[PDB]
Amino acid sequence: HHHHKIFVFGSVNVDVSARMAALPRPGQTVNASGYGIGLGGKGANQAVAVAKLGGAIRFVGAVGHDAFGELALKQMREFGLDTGSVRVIDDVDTGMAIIQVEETGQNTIAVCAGANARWSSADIDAYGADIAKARITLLQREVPHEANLAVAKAVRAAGGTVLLDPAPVGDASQMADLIALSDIISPNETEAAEITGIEPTDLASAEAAGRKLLERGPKIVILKLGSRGALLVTADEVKHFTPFKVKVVDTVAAGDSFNGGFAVAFSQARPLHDCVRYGSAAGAIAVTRVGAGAAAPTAREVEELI
Amino acid sequence: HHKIFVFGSVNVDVSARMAALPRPGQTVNASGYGIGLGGKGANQAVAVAKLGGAIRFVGAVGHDAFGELALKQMREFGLDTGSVRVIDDVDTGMAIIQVEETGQNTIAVCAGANARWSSADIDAYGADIAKARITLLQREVPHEANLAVAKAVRAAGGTVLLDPAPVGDASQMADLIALSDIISPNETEAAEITGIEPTDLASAEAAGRKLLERGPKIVILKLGSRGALLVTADEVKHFTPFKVKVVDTVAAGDSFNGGFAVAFSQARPLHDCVRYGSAAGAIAVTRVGAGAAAPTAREVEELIGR
Amino acid sequence: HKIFVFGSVNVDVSARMAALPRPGQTVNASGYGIGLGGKGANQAVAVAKLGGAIRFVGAVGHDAFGELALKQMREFGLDTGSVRVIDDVDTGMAIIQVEETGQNTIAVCAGANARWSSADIDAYGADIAKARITLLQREVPHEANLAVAKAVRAAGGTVLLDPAPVGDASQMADLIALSDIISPNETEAAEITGIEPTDLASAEAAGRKLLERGPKIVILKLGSRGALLVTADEVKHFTPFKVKVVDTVAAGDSFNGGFAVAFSQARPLHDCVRYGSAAGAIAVTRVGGAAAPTAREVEELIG
Amino acid sequence: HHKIFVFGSVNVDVSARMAALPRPGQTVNASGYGIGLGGKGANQAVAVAKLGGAIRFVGAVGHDAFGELALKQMREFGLDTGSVRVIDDVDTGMAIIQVEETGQNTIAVCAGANARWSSADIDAYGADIAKARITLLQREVPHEANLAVAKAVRAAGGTVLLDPAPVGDASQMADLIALSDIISPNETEAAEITGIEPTDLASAEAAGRKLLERGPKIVILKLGSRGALLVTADEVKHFTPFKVKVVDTVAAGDSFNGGFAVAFSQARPLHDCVRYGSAAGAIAVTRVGAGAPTAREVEELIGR
Amino acid sequence: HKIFVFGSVNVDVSARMAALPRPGQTVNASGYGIGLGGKGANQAVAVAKLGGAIRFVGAVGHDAFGELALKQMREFGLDTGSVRVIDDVDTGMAIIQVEETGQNTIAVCAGANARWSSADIDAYGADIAKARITLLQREVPHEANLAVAKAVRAAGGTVLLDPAPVGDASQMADLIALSDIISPNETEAAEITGIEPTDLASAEAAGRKLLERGPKIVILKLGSRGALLVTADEVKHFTPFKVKVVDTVAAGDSFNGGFAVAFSQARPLHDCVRYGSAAGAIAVTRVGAGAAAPTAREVEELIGR
Amino acid sequence: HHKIFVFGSVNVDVSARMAALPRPGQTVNASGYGIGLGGKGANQAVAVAKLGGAIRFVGAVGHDAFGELALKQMREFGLDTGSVRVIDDVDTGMAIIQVEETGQNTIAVCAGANARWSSADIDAYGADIAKARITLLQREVPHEANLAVAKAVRAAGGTVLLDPAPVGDASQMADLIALSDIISPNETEAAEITGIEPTDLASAEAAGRKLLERGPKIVILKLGSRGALLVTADEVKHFTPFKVKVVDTVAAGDSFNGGFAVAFSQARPLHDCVRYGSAAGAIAVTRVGAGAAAPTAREVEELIGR
Numbered sequence A: 001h002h003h004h005k006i007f008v009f010g011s012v013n014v015d016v017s018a019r020m021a022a023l024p025r026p027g028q029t030v031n032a033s034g035y036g037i038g039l040g041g042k043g044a045n046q047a048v049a050v051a052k053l054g055g056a057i058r059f060v061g062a063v064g065h066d067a068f069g070e071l072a073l074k075q076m077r078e079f080g081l082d083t084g085s086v087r088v089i090d091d092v093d094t095g096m097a098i099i100q101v102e103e104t105g106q107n108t109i110a111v112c113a114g115a116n117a118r119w120s121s122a123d124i125d126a127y128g129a130d131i132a133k134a135r136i137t138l139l140q141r142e143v144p145h146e147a148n149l150a151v152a153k154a155v156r157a158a159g160g161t162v163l164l165d166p167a168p169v170g171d172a173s174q175m176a177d178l179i180a181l182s183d184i185i186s187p188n189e190t191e192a193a194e195i196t197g198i199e200p201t202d203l204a205s206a207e208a209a210g211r212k213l214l215e216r217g218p219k220i221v222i223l224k225l226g227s228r229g230a231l232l233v234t235a236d237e238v239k240h241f242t243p244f245k246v247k248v249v250d251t252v253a254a255g256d257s258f259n260g261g262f263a264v265a266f267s268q269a270r271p272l273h274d275c276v277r278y279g280s281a282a283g284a285i286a287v288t289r290v291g292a293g294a295a296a297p298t299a300r301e302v303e304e305l306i
Numbered sequence B, F: 001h002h003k004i005f006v007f008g009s010v011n012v013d014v015s016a017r018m019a020a021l022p023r024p025g026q027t028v029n030a031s032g033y034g035i036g037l038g039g040k041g042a043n044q045a046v047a048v049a050k051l052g053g054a055i056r057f058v059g060a061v062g063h064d065a066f067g068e069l070a071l072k073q074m075r076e077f078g079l080d081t082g083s084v085r086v087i088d089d090v091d092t093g094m095a096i097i098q099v100e101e102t103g104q105n106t107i108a109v110c111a112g113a114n115a116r117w118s119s120a121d122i123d124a125y126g127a128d129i130a131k132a133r134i135t136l137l138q139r140e141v142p143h144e145a146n147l148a149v150a151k152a153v154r155a156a157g158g159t160v161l162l163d164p165a166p167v168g169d170a171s172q173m174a175d176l177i178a179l180s181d182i183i184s185p186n187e188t189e190a191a192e193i194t195g196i197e198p199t200d201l202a203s204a205e206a207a208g209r210k211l212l213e214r215g216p217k218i219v220i221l222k223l224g225s226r227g228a229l230l231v232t233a234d235e236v237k238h239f240t241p242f243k244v245k246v247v248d249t250v251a252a253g254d255s256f257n258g259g260f261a262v263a264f265s266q267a268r269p270l271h272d273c274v275r276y277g278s279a280a281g282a283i284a285v286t287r288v289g290a291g292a293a294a295p296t297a298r299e300v301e302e303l304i305g306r
Numbered sequence C: 001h002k003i004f005v006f007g008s009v010n011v012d013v014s015a016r017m018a019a020l021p022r023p024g025q026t027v028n029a030s031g032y033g034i035g036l037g038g039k040g041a042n043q044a045v046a047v048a049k050l051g052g053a054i055r056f057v058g059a060v061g062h063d064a065f066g067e068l069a070l071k072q073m074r075e076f077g078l079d080t081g082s083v084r085v086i087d088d089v090d091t092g093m094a095i096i097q098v099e100e101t102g103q104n105t106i107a108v109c110a111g112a113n114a115r116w117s118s119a120d121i122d123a124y125g126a127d128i129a130k131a132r133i134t135l136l137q138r139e140v141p142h143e144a145n146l147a148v149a150k151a152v153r154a155a156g157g158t159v160l161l162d163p164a165p166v167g168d169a170s171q172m173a174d175l176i177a178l179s180d181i182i183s184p185n186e187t188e189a190a191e192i193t194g195i196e197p198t199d200l201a202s203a204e205a206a207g208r209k210l211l212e213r214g215p216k217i218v219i220l221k222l223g224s225r226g227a228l229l230v231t232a233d234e235v236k237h238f239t240p241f242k243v244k245v246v247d248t249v250a251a252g253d254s255f256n257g258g259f260a261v262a263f264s265q266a267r268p269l270h271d272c273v274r275y276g277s278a279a280g281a282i283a284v285t286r287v288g289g290a291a292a293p294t295a296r297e298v299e300e301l302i303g
Numbered sequence D: 001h002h003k004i005f006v007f008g009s010v011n012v013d014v015s016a017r018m019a020a021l022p023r024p025g026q027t028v029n030a031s032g033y034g035i036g037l038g039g040k041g042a043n044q045a046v047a048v049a050k051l052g053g054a055i056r057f058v059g060a061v062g063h064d065a066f067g068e069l070a071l072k073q074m075r076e077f078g079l080d081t082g083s084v085r086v087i088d089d090v091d092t093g094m095a096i097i098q099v100e101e102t103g104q105n106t107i108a109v110c111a112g113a114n115a116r117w118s119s120a121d122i123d124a125y126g127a128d129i130a131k132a133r134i135t136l137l138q139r140e141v142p143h144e145a146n147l148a149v150a151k152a153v154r155a156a157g158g159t160v161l162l163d164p165a166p167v168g169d170a171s172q173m174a175d176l177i178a179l180s181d182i183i184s185p186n187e188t189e190a191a192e193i194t195g196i197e198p199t200d201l202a203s204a205e206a207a208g209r210k211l212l213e214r215g216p217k218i219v220i221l222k223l224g225s226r227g228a229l230l231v232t233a234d235e236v237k238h239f240t241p242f243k244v245k246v247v248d249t250v251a252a253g254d255s256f257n258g259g260f261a262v263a264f265s266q267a268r269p270l271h272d273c274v275r276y277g278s279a280a281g282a283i284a285v286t287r288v289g290a291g292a293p294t295a296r297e298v299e300e301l302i303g304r
Numbered sequence E: 001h002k003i004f005v006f007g008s009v010n011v012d013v014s015a016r017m018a019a020l021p022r023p024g025q026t027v028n029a030s031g032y033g034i035g036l037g038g039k040g041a042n043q044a045v046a047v048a049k050l051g052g053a054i055r056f057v058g059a060v061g062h063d064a065f066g067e068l069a070l071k072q073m074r075e076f077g078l079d080t081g082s083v084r085v086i087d088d089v090d091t092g093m094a095i096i097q098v099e100e101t102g103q104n105t106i107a108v109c110a111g112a113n114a115r116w117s118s119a120d121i122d123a124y125g126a127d128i129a130k131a132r133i134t135l136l137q138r139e140v141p142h143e144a145n146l147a148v149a150k151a152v153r154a155a156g157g158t159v160l161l162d163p164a165p166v167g168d169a170s171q172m173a174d175l176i177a178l179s180d181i182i183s184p185n186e187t188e189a190a191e192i193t194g195i196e197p198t199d200l201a202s203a204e205a206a207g208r209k210l211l212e213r214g215p216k217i218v219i220l221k222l223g224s225r226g227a228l229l230v231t232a233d234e235v236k237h238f239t240p241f242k243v244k245v246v247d248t249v250a251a252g253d254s255f256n257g258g259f260a261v262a263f264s265q266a267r268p269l270h271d272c273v274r275y276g277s278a279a280g281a282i283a284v285t286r287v288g289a290g291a292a293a294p295t296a297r298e299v300e301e302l303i304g305r
């Protein structure tokens, strides 16, 4: 066995996805050609991504005591994720999202916090042992802010590393004090646009956007630029990482794969450059497929691409 | 082998309340959701069961969790589920309902196992159709299977109650209506089938007389807030609505049809049958959903005495 | 008026000869006759001569054959006041040539019978509504028959359909769906249901098939073997009356008129099938019909 | 009175246009039909009447519906039906011609009342036949009755124009021809009577001269599209056809004989009589069916 | 020539006796005579003796009776160029046995007269065409008489038919139909039509029956009572001329020759019948046919008396 | 190009000694007075210079007599004044100190030029800040100016030593502490910031751990006569006080920060930096005044080797 070097705290959802010819207009009933139900949520997705890439992973999230919660746990373990630290809350509904997708790819999403919204800064104290010994710690913005803050404080207290995915941006000022406690931050084009006000329209403006993030507490900024690669910005360097050429199929939650892959290399003490490249390759393989379950990138697939 | 026979769809309704529906490309935060039994066939069969009618229900669900939930809730409402097909390798039909604060909704329905029905399959139920004093049909299952049920009833000298919802292809249902002894369209369905919008009792009668030409001998125009209108070759009677507190009018027609079906199997006069459905619909609007809040015989008789 | 008949009017040019002529040949005919024809006028006359209160609705051309058809109708007791005379069209007409052995060749011109439209039927909305039973055949445009059937349905009447000639089976599946009573014979039931009624066991099977298509009452005309009544609730075999057989053409058209008359008089259903069965048997004993069975004759046969 | 006397068959013609003849046991549909007066007797009698001839037509019909209609059609054509015998207990003559879209025809003919004539029946018309300047006959009634009419004309010194159509028993008509003063066969009939096929004017004269051996003094070979050829013991003259737009050539011979007989009854020169029949036949082809050319049309064509 | 005669040529063996022989008996006769005979020859000689331009076609054998026949005809003015002489056949000849009371008995061998065939008549198409009138009888093969009558009909001429002997009444029905003039005596009219002409009323009815059979002119030879002209336009009775009667044999043959001769001369029909009536009366005043045959001078004298 | 950057307040101190503090409306005589350099900015800069550190000092004085005086005394204490801004139309900062023989102090402070600093004014010193190994801030200048400097250091990957003195509004400076790599609060300032009174080494440590939660990686609790406590995520070490003849303990913390900065800028181990400022603090209390009488490298090393 292996000590848990990566700690992920974040949301657990059951995603109900439907494919249809046309999205329903207000007041309209339409037909869909099919649907699926699978594990979802920024927390569980990133934790799974770390697991499929070989990381020693400890995921902490909450499901309800209901049929969707039993489904979320059953999937995560089918995905090699130990659910020992996943809270089961009786008298709350499991978080869950409604995803409607039409032929052209346009979609509408609606998310119910469910068991994710029950986290308090006090509930985090129970995991301070696991957090304090974790080499890197992944957060998102799909759980209550006081709970994310409590994790970030604990990490600073132990002198660890907080990787923050600032997604969804939400209240930008409310996350200003979360970013201050983060050690690494990985915004995409939109998120960096709201946090700094600078739209990363090209590589010169994206470097200016990253240098503004250096002023807010993070020491490493990794601007996820989608099809145009990634930009690593620090006080001491700026390096563009060329995107990997792949057949694009479904680009949803590629960033979630990116953070996971980065966190696995980081937990392995690989040099920072190798960490960014491992994340960018994990994201590249994540677009070549549909979904982030069994189709999530593995170490074998990623390293062959590299 | 029961005096009332319902053949139709079984859905699972994933309803999601939220402040505003998502515009295309948008993510929204919903305030909560529920999962429950739906479908026009399962609604109407449950409405008969809760009103004390002896009913045999025929429908299909997948061998998945949503199938298990539909079967279990059917039993909870008094419906015997022994004639419900459980088809492997096919998802239970499901509907994604998004409900706004203002009230505007948005539905997306996946046929699911409901689409697996064939005219061949109906031969396995010829026994139950023979003993049926009335047979309820809707438009949420393959047309050839609806037609096969209709032929069995007509050969057996029974009675067919056709809810023409959704209208779909009105020309395709021309033959199903031809074999339908009783047809119960609401305002919209009457206007689409005949081209006459029932804006008043004069016009509603005219739409009903246009339907008499197509095979039915009894037409029951459901007018929502204005009650119903019985039209036949011999009489026109307008049934006033019962004064009730309106809360959620969805599927008020489904409870009206089960109310009529039960009173019909009880050999009650035709007028009494329509009144029973008119009361059962009235109770259906006073509560939310059909489910375990579906009208009971106790409640209906109370409303007629009032 | 309690019986409404909407159908074809023909003039039947019938010729008898020892052998039918081959292409390009000229033969001599031992004789010929000319009489009223067409499934519509035959049934309408059979009802008239049996004492029914009937309104016949047919079309004839404004030519000599039109005046021959109207004249012969009036002498059989049928009021022709509702028979349209159409200018610039020929009356319906059928040449029949008969060989000594019986092999016959027929050529039919639709004439005025093809001029009926579904809009033309609105002029008879009041008649159709007041009728207790309405007799229809397949010798007029399908759109016109459907208009009549829709009128009866709206009014709650009864539609007696003789599916003759069978013609396009698919086109008339929807005329059957609006029919209350259907009266196919052996050959017609075979084509419609795909079941040959070669005996009473298979005849019931075919009749049950027809019950799946809209009619509630099926009366299989079985020729020399009587008729079979098939409904959701009963099956009865109506044995034929023993009679000397002379010419069996259009015996079914007197059976349908006999049923119509008894039905219009509110007699029990079995009594209506027997009354039609007697009228058919009386028809076979004579040629053509100028001697269409009468109520007096039919009642004598039942006793 | 009535200088021109015609005796022969009266028919009603039911003609049905249709696409493919019915096979035994089949029921076909026909695009349409017409119904009109028929029979070579009535056809020629109507031809004379419409051309201004004083005509007394004698024919037999049944006491049935097609009789009344045959009589009604005659009157509208301008033919007096006072001498048409109506026999009760017999069918009127009738034919059923079923044409095809390819041309094939199936004809069934019931002789009807036409077969009832006897040699005795003719004596009731001994007066009329005597006054007859000319007498038209055909081969569609009993032979015994044709002979009796001929004997009556010969006994009064009149004239007997015989249309030898249909030929039928060529041998049985050797004695009707001998009582005939004028004979007007077409190509097929002349070939079947004399044995000479009239393919060209020389061979047609050879056929006519053989016919002169059998009693007729005048022979008029109706050559169809090439006119007609007059053959007698003293002369042979070809009568060129009139150039006309051909449409339907059926029974143009009947319009020819009637036109000749009208000119003959008016005492016109023999050549003028033949040319009048040539013109009447030319007009008859330009249309479909009888009422057949009129005198105004025949003169218009002759002088065109 | 303008008159054509086709018919029989006989040598008549006439024997007189008191009583005809009964079967098996042998009886003496008081005399006999041999001379020309036959209906073809008799009418041909009468035409020649009355001055008419005549072409006679008959057949005789190459035997003595043929040479006798031929010599007599030339003795009476008849050119015999067109008389066939067939070898291997006996000249036509009749056996006449006459009682002293008047009755008589005749047995006729056809001889060369029977050798005529329809084909043989093609050789006289030229002579037939030039003929104004053609005289026929019933003493030659029927197919040959028809062949001639067809040639006259096609040529537009006239066929005078003497329906004698009557023989098969159905066989001569179609010879009468091609005949323009017919001159039966009382008995011949009786068998052809069925009406016995016992007087002028019944004689006319017999003539009108013959008018139905094709001929345009009927001349009923009534013997001692004259003749009757019957046509579709007129009926005229020609009284007999008063003459002393001696032997009336073949008086009809002289009547047909008289009519023929006047016809070829284009005299009116009435005058042709009277010319025959006069010639017939002259014939009865004398005995025999060729010798008794009248002449133009004898006829005109009688007509002018 | 200097290895230490100090930014802060500059004051002229008018110190007056008398027997009794005047009461309102009263005029008392003072035995003597002196006029010298002051302000936490200048004090820390002067101590750095007097200990041998290469320092660039940034502060503001007016264009008046006290501006010339402060500049003159800075140059005497070894401090290059090239980068001290001189602002026209504003007085030089100045405190008025009246101290009794008994020992009761009384201070009235005019902000003067010190309050003119803005966040924009800091952009002129981005070059110096980027080259600085360590940077010292205090709480005697506008807050947005200190935050501007701290952001500039974060961008350049430098180090920010924060003296949280005067604490003032602790909530205001929570975002400045997040940018502060090293923080050196005394007992009173630690109690205000965290809420824990450092009465002994257990409570002092607990306050230090609570301060690590707010972003700083190194905490140095100045305990005065009881030494100092170094607290980090990896270690806790109590640095015993050097035995010295206490005379005047005023501004001993400023000498402690100057000593730490100097030994930090020479790359001495962390422990050797804490003891360097421990010794410089001890010397500072044996004498009066933190100007010409500031400790020196010779003095500090001699105490460390005593």
Ligand SMILES: Nc1ncnc2c1ncn2[C@@H]1O[C@H](COP(=O)(O)OP(=O)(O)O)[C@@H](O)[C@H]1O
Pocket (backbone or CB within 6 Å): A187, A188, A189, A223, A224, A225, A226, A227, A229, A230, A243, A244, A245, A246, A248, A251, A252, A253, A254, A255, A256, A258, A279, A280, A281, A282, A283, A284, A287
């Ligand atoms: N089509 C692509 N080709 C190559 N790399 C890709 C592609 N899409 C995504 N990636 C990689 O995945 C990372 C995340 O992409 P992005 O879509 O910006 O994430 P997010 O989910 O935050 O939008 C990028 O930095 C890039 O390296």
Ligand SMILES: Nc1ncnc2c1ncn2[C@@H]1O[C@H](COP(=O)(O)OP(=O)(O)O)[C@@H](O)[C@H]1O
Pocket (backbone or CB within 6 Å): B186, B187, B221, B222, B223, B224, B225, B226, B227, B228, B241, B242, B243, B244, B246, B249, B250, B251, B252, B253, B254, B256, B277, B278, B279, B280, B281, B282, B285
């Ligand atoms: N507001 C109401 N008050 C009283 N009765 C009602 C009301 N709405 C519906 N009903 C009853 O329920 C029946 C069904 O109504 P409707 O909503 O038209 O059917 P559907 O739901 O199929 O459109 C009506 O005939 C009526 O009797």
Ligand SMILES: Nc1ncnc2c1ncn2[C@@H]1O[C@H](COP(=O)(O)OP(=O)(O)O)[C@@H](O)[C@H]1O
Pocket (backbone or CB within 6 Å): C185, C186, C220, C221, C222, C223, C224, C225, C226, C227, C240, C241, C242, C243, C245, C248, C249, C250, C251, C252, C253, C255, C276, C277, C278, C279, C280, C281, C284
């Ligand atoms: N030979 C018969 N004896 C008795 N009844 C007969 C006879 N033929 C026909 N019928 C009666 O007439 C009806 C019609 O016979 P069918 O020949 O089928 O009519 P169609 O002309 O319509 O075929 C039968 O149902 C029967 O009752």
Ligand SMILES: Nc1ncnc2c1ncn2[C@@H]1O[C@H](COP(=O)(O)OP(=O)(O)O)[C@@H](O)[C@H]1O
Pocket (backbone or CB within 6 Å): D186, D187, D221, D222, D223, D224, D225, D226, D227, D228, D241, D242, D243, D244, D246, D249, D250, D251, D252, D253, D254, D256, D277, D278, D279, D280, D281, D282, D285
């Ligand atoms: N196409 C034509 N043009 C001119 N005259 C014609 C034409 N066809 C027929 N005739 C005239 O009509 C007469 C009869 O024609 P034909 O058809 O031979 O008679 P039938 O119908 O008896 O055979 C001919 O003699 C000729 O004069």
Ligand SMILES: Nc1ncnc2c1ncn2[C@@H]1O[C@H](COP(=O)(O)OP(=O)(O)O)[C@@H](O)[C@H]1O
Pocket (backbone or CB within 6 Å): E184, E185, E186, E220, E221, E222, E223, E224, E225, E226, E227, E240, E241, E242, E243, E245, E248, E249, E250, E251, E252, E253, E255, E276, E277, E278, E279, E280, E281, E284
């Ligand atoms: N006795 C007579 N007296 C006057 N004329 C006669 C006499 N006999 C005959 N004729 C004339 O001869 C013609 C022929 O007489 P008939 O006896 O009829 O000839 P046959 O009997 O030979 O044919 C008669 O028409 C008549 O004109």
Ligand SMILES: Nc1ncnc2c1ncn2[C@@H]1O[C@H](COP(=O)(O)OP(=O)(O)O)[C@@H](O)[C@H]1O
Pocket (backbone or CB within 6 Å): F185, F186, F187, F221, F222, F223, F224, F225, F226, F227, F228, F241, F242, F243, F244, F246, F249, F250, F251, F252, F253, F254, F256, F277, F278, F279, F280, F281, F282, F285
């Ligand atoms: N009496 C003393 N003996 C030894 N060292 C001292 C003494 N006073 C102060 N120091 C040193 O100076 C540092 C700062 O003292 P402190 O009173 O906290 O200053 P301030 O309160 O002004 O921040 C202490 O950590 C200690 O090392």
Ligand SMILES: [Cl-]
Pocket (backbone or CB within 6 Å): A074, A077
């Ligand atoms: Cl498990």
Ligand SMILES: [Cl-]
Pocket (backbone or CB within 6 Å): A088, A089, A090
């Ligand atoms: Cl809990």
Ligand SMILES: [Cl-]
Pocket (backbone or CB within 6 Å): D132, D133
């Ligand atoms: Cl005349």
Ligand SMILES: [Cl-]
Pocket (backbone or CB within 6 Å): D294, D296, D297
């Ligand atoms: Cl005119």
Ligand SMILES: [Cl-]
Pocket (backbone or CB within 6 Å): E130
């Ligand atoms: Cl000449």
Ligand SMILES: [Cl-]
Pocket (backbone or CB within 6 Å): F072, F075
């Ligand atoms: Cl100086």
Ligand SMILES: [Cl-]
Pocket (backbone or CB within 6 Å): F086, F087, F088
């Ligand atoms: Cl300034």
